[PDB]
Amino acid sequence: GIVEQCCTSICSLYQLENYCN
Amino acid sequence: GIVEQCCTSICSLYQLENYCN
Amino acid sequence: FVNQHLCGSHLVEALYLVCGERGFFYTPK
Amino acid sequence: FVNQHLCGSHLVEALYLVCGERGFFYTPK
Secondary structure (H helix, E strand, C coil): CHHHHHCCCCCCHHHHHCCEC | CHHHHHCCCCCCHHHHHCCEC | CCCCCCCCHHHHHHHHHHHHHHCEEECCC | CCCCCCCCHHHHHHHHHHHHHHCEEECCC
């Protein structure tokens, strides 16, 4: 989920946009 | 939606919890 | 902190604090 | 601001800024 991709690993715009509505 | 209940009117815990997963 | 007008980042912060591990959805429109 | 480790309120803030009017969902678990 987002925590794995962005908190415990380095986040990216690409991944953040996966969680926009 | 949440903006109507919490931003343009006074928010509440009751209403915020409506938007928890 | 919840019993006020809350907009934008201020509203997202309140959701974050209230909802805890559950998480939340923010849909402004 | 997006290319870093982002946790908790710091992560919610980045979602808020990126997603704009769309809004977003935050599900940590």
